[PDB]
Amino acid sequence: VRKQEIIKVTEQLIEAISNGDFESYTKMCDPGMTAFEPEALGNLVEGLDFHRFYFENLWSRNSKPVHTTILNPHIHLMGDESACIAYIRITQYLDAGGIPRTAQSEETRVWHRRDGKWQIVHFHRSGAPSVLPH
Amino acid sequence: VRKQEIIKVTEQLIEAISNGDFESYTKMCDPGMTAFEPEALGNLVEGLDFHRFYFENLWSRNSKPVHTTILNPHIHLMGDESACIAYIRITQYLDAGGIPRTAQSEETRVWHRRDGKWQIVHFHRSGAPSVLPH
Amino acid sequence: VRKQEIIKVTEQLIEAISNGDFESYTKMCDPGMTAFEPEALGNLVEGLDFHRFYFENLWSRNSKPVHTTILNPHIHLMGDESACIAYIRITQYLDAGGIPRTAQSEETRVWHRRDGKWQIVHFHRSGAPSVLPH
Amino acid sequence: VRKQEIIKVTEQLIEAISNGDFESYTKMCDPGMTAFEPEALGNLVEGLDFHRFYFENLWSRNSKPVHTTILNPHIHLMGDESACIAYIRITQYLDAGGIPRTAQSEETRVWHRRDGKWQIVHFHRSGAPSVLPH
Amino acid sequence: VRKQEIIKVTEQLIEAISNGDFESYTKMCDPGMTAFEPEALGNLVEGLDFHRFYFENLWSRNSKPVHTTILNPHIHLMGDESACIAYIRITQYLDAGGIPRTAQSEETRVWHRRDGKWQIVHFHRSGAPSVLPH
Amino acid sequence: VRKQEIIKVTEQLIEAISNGDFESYTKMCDPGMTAFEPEALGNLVEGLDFHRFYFENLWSRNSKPVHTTILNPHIHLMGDESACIAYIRITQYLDAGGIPRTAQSEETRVWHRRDGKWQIVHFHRSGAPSVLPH
Amino acid sequence: VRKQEIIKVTEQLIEAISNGDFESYTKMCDPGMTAFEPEALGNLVEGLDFHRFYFENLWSRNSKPVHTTILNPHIHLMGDESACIAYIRITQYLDAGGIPRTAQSEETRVWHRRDGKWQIVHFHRSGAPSVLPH
Amino acid sequence: VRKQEIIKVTEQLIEAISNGDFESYTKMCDPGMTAFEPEALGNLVEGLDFHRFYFENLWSRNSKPVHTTILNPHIHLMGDESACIAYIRITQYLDAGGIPRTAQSEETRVWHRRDGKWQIVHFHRSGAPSVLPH
Amino acid sequence: VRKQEIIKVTEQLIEAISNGDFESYTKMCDPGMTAFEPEALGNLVEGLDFHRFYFENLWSRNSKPVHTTILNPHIHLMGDESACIAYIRITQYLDAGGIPRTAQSEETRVWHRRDGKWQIVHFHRSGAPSVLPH
Amino acid sequence: VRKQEIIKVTEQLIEAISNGDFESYTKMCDPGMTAFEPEALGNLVEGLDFHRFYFENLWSRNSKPVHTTILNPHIHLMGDESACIAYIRITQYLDAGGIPRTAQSEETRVWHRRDGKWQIVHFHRSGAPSVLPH
Amino acid sequence: VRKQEIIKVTEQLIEAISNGDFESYTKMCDPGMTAFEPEALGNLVEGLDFHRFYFENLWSRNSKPVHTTILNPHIHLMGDESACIAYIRITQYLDAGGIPRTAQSEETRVWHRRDGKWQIVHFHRSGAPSVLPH
Amino acid sequence: VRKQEIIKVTEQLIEAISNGDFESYTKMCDPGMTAFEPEALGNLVEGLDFHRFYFENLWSRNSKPVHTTILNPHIHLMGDESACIAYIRITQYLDAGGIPRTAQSEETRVWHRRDGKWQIVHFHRSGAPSVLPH
Amino acid sequence: VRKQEIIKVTEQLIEAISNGDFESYTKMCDPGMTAFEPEALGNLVEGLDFHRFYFENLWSRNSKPVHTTILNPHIHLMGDESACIAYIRITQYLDAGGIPRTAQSEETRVWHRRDGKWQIVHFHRSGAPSVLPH
Amino acid sequence: VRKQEIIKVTEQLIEAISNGDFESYTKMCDPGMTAFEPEALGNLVEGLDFHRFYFENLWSRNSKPVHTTILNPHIHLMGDESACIAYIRITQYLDAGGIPRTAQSEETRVWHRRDGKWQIVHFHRSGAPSVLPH
């Protein structure tokens, strides 16, 4: 039972990023959230304003065909408040010539249930950048 | 107070890996532990036998000078059972010519307190491989 | 006799992919079907939605001249329910300049007769990508 | 229950190849077995004499440290006689300088139970060659 | 005397290919004819449908200036039914800029007299592709 | 029946070349035999003295492990006197470091039965040189 | 308390440069200010006229989207008159194709409180040039 | 007068580093000292243990000929407690072949007079690494 | 005296080729004439139809400025019927941009006086192709 | 009949060069003989002293295995005194590692019968240098 | 006092070159003036006509934004008639895309006071050419 | 005195070439004049028709700005009839983009006074081609 | 007369550097002497201690054959106290293999007669480094 | 008659250089002789001391096999005192591996008969350096 709720909230977050829905994304993140990812050049960023730039300059503007597969999700439940999920992410997208391409990333998300709502406190991404290559 | 215990157990684990102490490392890991790192080629590994190969073929054999700095540790406490730590790791080492070199990695470790003992349930590494370049 | 039916259903499937007929392709695949191929970046995919992207963005749209040769089909029959076919596939196609090109792949398909109908349960491709190079 | 027997016989075969035990390997293969793999240059080979060359010139001679991980095995059972297994294979080995390296392959094996004994009738490999790179 | 008839029928076939006359080419080939050539990627093709693609997409459409020289034809007569011819082929053609170019191939053709008519049963080409380079 | 004799005499010839047995090779060739192959630089050679150089400087001297596979032999019988065989040839050999390698060639041989004995009148090779690469 | 005023005046200066406000920048700099940065080719520049060129030819003209993050500011207070700040600077900007990019620099600023107003007496920059790459 | 004391203590520190005198270097640094330099990979380091590695593995061991020139020192005095110095540094050294080479760096040092003794609170280096290139 | 007639007829032939006068060129060549030159790819051509292609596709069409110098002609007279001439040829021409270029070739021509008229029986060219480079 | 004498004297000359027999070579050349070949850098040489250097520094010293094939000799007879021969030359030789190699050249020789003896008055070579590549 | 007059006349000359004022430049140069600079290809030029070409083809025509900094001028006074000045020159300019660039040169000027007027008798430039790179 | 006349006639000749005045150039050259220069590909040319091509296709057509400097002329007088001059030549010219460029050549001219008029009998050029590079 | 004394003292200085005679070099330099040269990386050095390193590590140790030519010395005399000399310098030397090499530099030296003795106050070098290349 | 004496004295000089006979070379040169050649880097040298370095470090020491051909000497006689010779020079030599090589240069020599003896007043060389390449 309880592992399916961590998959559900993770798929909802990946959908909100894909739509460019920064309002829904802001409800799902902790305000003190930290991140490691390729765009931050090896630094640990904190809060949502680093991410807001990609929403305002890509995700809110973009309307191209994109598809995401979550492969082999492994979930750790750590009492009733706390969870971790690790998965491989495959992205299919059309390039600047309109040709299909595939990208892979490795992703970790750490979730805490605050006031009865699940929120991300940390995430780590490796492999392909979130800004897709052309 | 409680954030210092997560720093302590993380430094003890980094020391056990550096010494090649697979017995102490086995006490600090959960048997169901998962990992993402450069040596696994983008796959999620599970359990300790993938790591045992680097202990038996490098860390247990090695006696060269190496130094580690943990930069900017950020810690999330998620109730009394559960914690996450994220940091930048700098490694100083001598190359095959005896010349000093520096490497950087980005690291996340997820800790759960099981039967009163802290253990790693998941980790994620990016940047430099653990097998240092020459 | 029975080896010719495995050749027949394999040629019908290659024709449905070539036409972009995702409805006919969906009748010939098991819903739990797995695949290895160049577009999946070394991962094992499951179900039909990874493939649906190439139907919707290429095969359903495409009208260029293409020809396929099946070379040296070897067939194993494993009782009355189960079969395997292995072959070399040659594809002739026109490039973006309108010049003829040739590509080669190596293909395995595993068939099970469910409710009296043959369906693919697994496939593996090597060599040329299915998205043809220009 | 029955999926564990396909994992067992697959691990026993990978062990016999790793030991250079061509006698045990010959008991586990069908005499009419076919294969696709990187060493055959894109051709379909048949019978055991192509493989005998790597046993006699490497596997029977070799004594270096090597470790294998089978990741995410997916199994199809197709009546009581017939089975297919698909997995990712990770190999850890020491290079010519004595440094640890990792390789990945994608593997399919098709099994038939003949006279009460499981035997391979076909296999397909992609990614890293079986002769490990240095 | 009899060697001149093998030269005659060989020059008539090279003319029919050059004109894009697939009807005349089909009269001169055996329906079971095999071939080795650069376009088949190192495979042995059988029958006429692999060749039909180059007639329909180039030879039937093309009207550029092209000239062919047969150099040093050597002929073996093997009773009254059977003959082999081996020669060097030089092709002069205009490139995409309208500049003259030269290409060389090495060619073997095996002829059998069936029902009083000479037909090709096998051919082998090396050197320049039949689709001329630009 | 009669196709097996063309396979037999072809395997005996490949064995005589592999042993460096120029006496047995001279019995199997016509004295007027012609050839196309990579070592002749695109020229048609005639008689046995071009080949004698590789017997005297390699095949008669060599004792390294080598294995040959004949893949997919296609045979044309052209009355009772005359035959043609076409096949793919795979060669496994050890390099100068003692590492296994694989090479591929495409081969045609034309046979005539003179005084009741089969002899080669022409041959054509493509792909890998007969002098194996290191 | 007092470290927050050094962060405030540093963020105000970074804002004035980003706006192209050379009048506000001139109020915040000492007239005898020195600098090390990538644009000065390894030389120590003095006064404001070297910087005036980038205001007049870029910052006063530019209206593209740009965002700045100050990471890990460390501050030394050296009596009541004098302060030093060191930080990592991340810049997000759109390239000439309109694609998001990230740059990193390392920055030191030395502040003196003259007539009750904080002013920069020296600065040093490393990493990315201030003129952003495209 | 007072600018000459900042030159004096800066030359004494450069001499202590050149000798490998970590005891004298430890007297001249603040225990909370921060640094930016090429060996730290773009990170801000704090305290003396990162630097101790180059003393123990190079400067304490080294006895080769080296010469240093300080070019164009500019000094800011900021009350009686606090000073900043900026200069270009030229290093002459013999390479691994015994040939003279030259390197350049740009350096800033921030000094505070604590308990009547001048100590470094921050430093920033650019250009050549401190570990000299060969 | 007699050496000047071999120079005369050689200059007349070079003029006829330069004009694209295939009728005059056909009067000066023997019908059985052989040639070695760069366009024939290392083969010996015979008769005039290989050369006719360059007359019909370049020399008859071309009207650009071209100049030829014959340097150091050496002549052998071999009785009253037979002569050989060897010379260096310099060609000045305008490229596709209208810029002057120079090319060099080495040329041999063998002349026989048949029915009182001098005709070329063989020629050999080296260096620059006759189709000038751009 | 008479064409066989031009082949004979040409094979005798190629043998004398291969042996390093400069005395026999001097009997077969005219003292006024001219040559074009790769070693003369595009110049026309005259007399025997340019060639004497390769006899004295290679051909007289050399004892390695070498074999020569004359392919497709074409001969022009020009009265009773004068002849020309043109052929392709294939050379088989062992390299510095002892591995067989092949080279090709194109050759013309002009012969005059002086005092009843055939002598070379001119020669022209193209393709491979006479000093064989390693 | 007297060093400021050498700075003044040097800045006036750099201004006259920047304006393309060849009349003012001619008043400031000796008619026998010599120069070393990158445009003269390592030669010593004499008089003003080599320089006149850059005035007439660039400096008199140019109207782009350019800025010059003189860094660290060192002056030698050698009696009342004679002076030398040495400095580093930084040039800021816009490229062909309108992007700011920086160049560095090293400059020496030798001045003599003739009839009460300072004039250049020699100059030497190194580093960046005077014709700025794009 | 007499050395100035050799400079005068040399400058007049360089002017006539620069103007494209082939009539004046023809008065200043001996009809038997020889030359070495980069355009002749290492050959010695004789007479004026090789040079006429550059007059007719460049110098007579050209109107771009060009300037020539003669550096360090050394003159040998060899009785009253004969002189030699050697100098370095610098050419300033505008490229195809309108940017100033510089070229260098080394030049020798040999003069003979025939019927009271100085004429060139030989010249030699090295370095830059006379056809200026773009 | 007076120009020969500037040549004399310049040749004596070049000799003292070539011998490694730092005592004689110190007598000929002003203690406040400045320099521009390739070894100083584009900086202006002052005094003799930068140069002392090349005396102590090369010139005092070296005994290889070296020869220097001064080409085209131009001298300006600026009253009775002051002189400037400009020349091209050619250096011939043996490389690490013992092969002759040539290098070129452009040099300026400024001389002042202090207390009746000529001394260098400034020098500038371009082209080849003083540390000769191998 | 008189042209043969210029060939004689030119061959004697080439022999004296080849022997390393600097005494004989000094008798044949004018003391004021000038030269252009590849070793002088595009400068005009004067007198014999530049050349003395190659005699003392190569020609006097060397004993390897070398051969020289003078091709196509053209001679101008300019009264009874003065002559010019121009020729192509071919050099055959053994490389560092003992393999024959060929080099080409273009050479001009200007001769004056002083006190009844011919002496070189100027020479110019192009193409291959005199120090032969390996």
Numbering used by the authors:
A (entry chain A), B (entry chain N), C (entry chain C), D (entry chain M), E (entry chain D), F (entry chain L), ...: 345 to 478
The authors write:
The 14-mer hub has a 12 Å increase in diameter and a larger central pore compared to the 12-mer hub in negative-stain single particle 2D-class averages of holoenzyme hubs. The overlay between the cryo-EM map and the atomic model for a single AD from the 14-mer α hub, shows a well-resolved backbone, except for two loops plus the N- and C-termini. The average Q-score for secondary structure elements, 0.73 for α-helices and 0.85 for β-sheets are higher than that for loops (0.66). The sequences from the structures were aligned, and the residues conserved across the mammalian isoforms were mapped onto our 14-mer cryo-EM α hub to show the dielectric variations in the contact interfaces. The root mean square fluctuation (RMSF) values showed that the VC is more rigid than the LC in the tetramer extracted from the α 14-mer (α14T), consistent with the ePISA estimates of the energetics. The superimposed structures of the 12-mers between α-isoform and β-isoform had a root mean square deviation (RMSD) of 0.35 Å, while that for the comparison of the 14-mers between the two isoforms is 0.3 Å.
Linkers with variable length and sequence between isoforms and developmental splice variants, connect each AD with a peripheral kinase domain (KD).
